[PDB]
Amino acid sequence: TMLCVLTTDAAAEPAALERALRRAAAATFDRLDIDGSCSTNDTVLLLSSGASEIPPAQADLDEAVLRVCDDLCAQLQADAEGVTKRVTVTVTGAATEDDALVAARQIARDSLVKTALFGSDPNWGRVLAAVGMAPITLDPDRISVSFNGAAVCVHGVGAPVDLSDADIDITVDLGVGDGQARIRTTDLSHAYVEENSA
Amino acid sequence: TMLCVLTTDAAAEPAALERALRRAAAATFDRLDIDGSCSTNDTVLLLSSGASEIPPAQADLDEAVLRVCDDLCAQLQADAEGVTKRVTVTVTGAATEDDALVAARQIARDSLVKTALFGSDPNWGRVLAAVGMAPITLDPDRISVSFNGAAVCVHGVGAPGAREVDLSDADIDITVDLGVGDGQARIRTTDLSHAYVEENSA
Amino acid sequence: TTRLLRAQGVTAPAGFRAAGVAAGIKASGALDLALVFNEGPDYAAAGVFTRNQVKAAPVLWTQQVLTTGRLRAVILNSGGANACTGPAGFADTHATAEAVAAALSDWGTETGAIEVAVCSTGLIGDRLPMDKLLAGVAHVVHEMHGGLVGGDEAAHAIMTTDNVPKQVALHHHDNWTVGGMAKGAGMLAPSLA
Amino acid sequence: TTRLLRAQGVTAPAGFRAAGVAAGIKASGALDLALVFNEGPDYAAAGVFTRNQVKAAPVLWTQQVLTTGRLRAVILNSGGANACTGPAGFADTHATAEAVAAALSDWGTETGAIEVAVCSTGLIGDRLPMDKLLAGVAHVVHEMHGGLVGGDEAAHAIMTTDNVPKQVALHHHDNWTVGGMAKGAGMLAPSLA
């Protein structure tokens, strides 16, 4: 379960808060996916006291709420159950932004990708097997996979990487458009398993 | 990867074999779901020599291929990577057959459901949380659940005794009833164990 | 001039008090009940909630309350989700909000239950220990304050399997601030609306 | 008396031979190459394949083969998926089917590549060791027999992370049989068409 309480002393009506919250939640919490299990209790609240007496431009209020939520998501990812790797899955070159998000989640949730990651293994094969199941526009012969900026798969085949560190970026380009999206996730560790079984 | 080859000495035209195989695969292999990861290589082939010189009725050919595939699915489940629990997830009372299958698969793939089962823990709340994410017609107040025949959830709340249900044995059946129709479906799955993680992270 | 800083939370902006107490909901004795209180002058609120078709009592309650766009307080517990607990679980949620409203009203600020958001987190399927929770409610109203440690305590009290709390505040150069706290380390794949 | 019997597989029905050999594809030197041969008189066949948009060379080749409704043999290797291997990987699949068809033609049954289904399982992204594979094709064709042990060696040869083979046969009371072997212990959630 993810609970979050936001507060502000900016002067803002409920409609102003709703916009800032819905934009931030779409970009941040909605793209945080640790173990692919969505809870019965998730809640995010945003309250204003207006104690500053200052009404911000809406764009600035939105940006402030986004920065807070995004940093909170970073903190949630860093303390996830059994975390050993802090993983970002970026999909670029999709037909649409939604396609990229769907692809990224498919990869992030996949149990063989997550275990390869726990093992510090730049296993692009498992990434391709995963993304191949995404319900989106896909050309297998146009896909590239990178781990920490190093291309290991290009044009859907192995290119002619040390993942020992905790931070891992996987970047997959689909070469079928300009849609892009990014998911924060983690690996599937013995620690995850033990915490959730014992 | 799942590879399967079937052979028959029954006399049958390609179209008869195709009907048999498609019907069997949909009911068996397509409902076998161990770790939620579909491979680049999966193949099922059905060959006929017709050496028996007997042309069976279509229904009889269908049933035989079905029984064979269903048994191989049981064997594949039983020897899954790091398996400790052979888990069958049945959903009944769904709005459609497809809804029940989508439900059953949502439960079977859930990492918290699977780790609870590895622990022999009847953490039925995890099953409710999982099923509530299925993109199906659902009424949370009409969900009932049994584990190995014992009630754990009744009309969306806990059954008395639920937390003492014994899941120590290797076989676990989860039956979830949705009270919104008569669509039903069954998935063969397994738990998520330390052995699975070790095998797939080495 | 704008500063985004960790180690600050819900009480960073003006007009908010918070606290966390151990109410004995958790067998361990750890902090398990948080309160966040808006001092005014304004009470604007917005909220988004799980898209899970199985929603806990406190979600159903708070979804209803947010239709007003107004909040005085948020009361949050760990040590139990109050989820899949049926009408009786929803009655407990209502009773919590009423108890917070009564404690605040007695403390000096007239509040109705409809102005109190309720959140819970923890095991699904058990009912809440109401004697402990209601005793905790009275306690936490008398501990809340505007200091940064009040925010810290509230952040700690909402933790379940978390090892550290999660807090941040954005200080805008135009002299307004957004503060936040969060929790969640597992069953963590939000889909909010 | 229709019976479903384990430890019996693809050579249980009449008109079928099989074998499995250690071609040196696996570093272990376990069995890694299997052959199933149809003796006729009929050669009817049907197939279904992964709905994954990323399809291995042998899936692409066998889908093509199956448009004829006709098969004389299936060659299957473990120790490598030959997946995501480009035009050259597809060439390797064709070279295997060609090799089997030639070897059958030498064995005594005239056969063309288009009559030979090809399956692979193992790691994704690596090329096959063709010298070793092709030497194994010669061996496996010379080894194939209609005995149960033939079906059994083939069921063993297709294993990767499996601990046991998977085999069954249904003997219908009208004197015909359906036999089967399978493998797969992980990356195991088929979606077939």
Please state, in angstroms and rounded to a whole number, the distance separating the CA atoms of residues B118 and B138.
27
Query: Nearest to residue A27, comparing CAs of A71, A58, A76?
Result: A71
Q: What is the CATH number of the domain that holds D187?
A: 3.60.70.12
Query: Nearest to residue C120, comparing CAs of C32, C47, C185, C191?
Result: C32
CB pairs under 8 A between B and D: 276
Same-domain pairing of A189 and A177: yes
Same-domain pairing of B23 and B85: no
Closest chain B C-alpha to C91 CA, distance in angstroms: 14
Closest chain D C-alpha to A32 CA, distance in angstroms: 24
Greatest extent of chain A over all pairs of C-alpha atoms, in Å: 61
Q: What is the CATH number of the domain that holds A88?
A: 3.10.20.340
Interface of B with D in 180-199 (CB under 8 A): 196, 199
Same-domain pairing of B101 and B69: no
Element (H, E) at C148: helix C148-157
Q: Which residues, 6 or more positions from B91, have their beta carbon under 8 angstroms from its beta carbon?
A: B100, B101, B103, B104, B107, B131, B175, B176, B177, B178, B183, B184, B185, B186
Please state, in angstroms and rounded to a whole number, the distance separating the CA atoms of residues B54 and A66.
71
Same-domain pairing of B85 and B153: yes
Same-domain pairing of A99 and A176: yes
Please state, in angstroms and rounded to a whole number, the distance separating the CA atoms of residues A156 and A175.
11
Same-domain pairing of A90 and A170: yes
Structure tokens at A36: 């692919």
Q: What is the DSSP secondary structure assignment for residue B115, as one 8-state letter?
A: H
Same-domain pairing of A60 and A95: no
Residue environment code for D84-93, b if the CB has 16+ CB neighbours within 10 A, otherwise e: bbeeebbebb
Q: What is the total count of domains within chain D?
A: 1
Structure tokens at A109: 């949730």
Q: How was this structure determined?
A: X-ray
Secondary structure (DSSP) of A38-79: --S--EEEEEE--TT-----HHHHHHHHHHHHHHHHHHHHHT
Q: What share of chain B is helix, strand, coil (3-state, %, to 5)?
A: 40, 25, 35
Residue environment code for A164-197, b if the CB has 16+ CB neighbours within 10 A, otherwise e: eeeebebbbbbebeebbbbbbbbbbbebbbbebb
State the residue for tokens 């489940």.
Answer: B77
Is D184 in contact with B13 (Cβ distance < 8 A)? no
Tell me whether chains C and D touch (3+ CB pairs under 8 A).
Answer: no
Q: What is the total count of domains within chain B?
A: 2
Q: Which domain holds residue C77?
A: 1-193
Which one of A1, A43, A137, A186 is the catalytic residue?
A1
Query: Which residues from chain C sit within 8 angstroms of residue B132, using beta carbons?
Result: 52-55
Same-domain pairing of B65 and B40: yes
Half-sphere exposure of C105 (CA within 13 A, CB side): 12
The residue of D53, D120, D128, D188 whose CB has the most chain A CBs within 10 angstroms, and thus the best one to mutate to test that interface, is D53
Please state, in angstroms and rounded to a whole number, the distance separating the CA atoms of residues D21 and D8.
18
Is C186 in contact with A196 (Cβ distance < 8 A)? yes
Strands C33-38 and D166-171: unpaired
Backbone φ and ψ for C135, nearest 5 degrees, come out as -70, -40
Is D190 in contact with B38 (Cβ distance < 8 A)? yes
Edge-to-edge strand list for the sheet holding A179-186:
A157-158, A150-154, A144-147, A167-173, A86-94, A179-186
Cβ–Cβ contact A161 with D under 8 A: no
Distance of CA A160 to the CA centre of its chain: 30
Are C123 and B128 in contact by the 8 Å Cβ rule? The answer is no
Same-domain pairing of B58 and B96: no
Residue of chain A whose alpha carbon sits nearest to that of B114: A197
State the residue for tokens 């020599």.
Answer: B49
Are C140 and C34 in contact by the 8 Å Cβ rule? The answer is yes
For residue D41, whether the previous peptide bond is cis, meaning omega lies within 30 degrees of 0, is yes
Is B200 in contact with A112 (Cβ distance < 8 A)? yes
Q: Where are the alpha helices (DSSP H) in D27-180?
A: 57-66, 86-107, 130-143, 148-157
Are B75 and B31 in contact by the 8 Å Cβ rule? The answer is no
Distance of CA B38 to the CA centre of its chain: 14
Angle at B200 between CA B191 and CA A153, to 5 degrees: 130
- The sign of the dihedral angle between the CA atoms of D101, D103, D107, D110 is positive
Cβ–Cβ contact B192 with A under 8 A: yes
User: Cα torsion at A123, D86, A109, C6 (round to 10°)?
Assistant: 60
Are C23 and C191 in contact by the 8 Å Cβ rule? The answer is no
A1 a catalytic residue: yes
Half-sphere exposure of C128 (CA within 13 A, CB side): 35
Same-domain pairing of A98 and A74: no
User: Which residue among A129, A131, A143 places its CB closest to the CB of D187?
Assistant: A129
CB pairs under 8 A between B and C: 54
Element (H, E) at C177: strand C177-183
Please state, in angstroms and rounded to a whole number, the distance separating the CA atoms of residues A132 and A116.
17
For residue C41, whether the previous peptide bond is cis, meaning omega lies within 30 degrees of 0, is yes
Cβ–Cβ contact B155 with C under 8 A: yes
Is D126 in contact with A158 (Cβ distance < 8 A)? yes
Residue of chain B whose alpha carbon sits nearest to that of C126: B158
Same-domain pairing of B146 and B58: no
In angstroms, what is the resolution? 1.7
C-beta atoms surrounding D97 within 10 Å:
26
Out of A79, A111, A130, pick the residue that ends a domain.
A79
Interface of A with C in 103-132 (CB under 8 A): 109
Q: Which domain holds residue B74?
A: 1-79
Beta bridge partners of A8: A48, C178
Same-domain pairing of B50 and B131: no
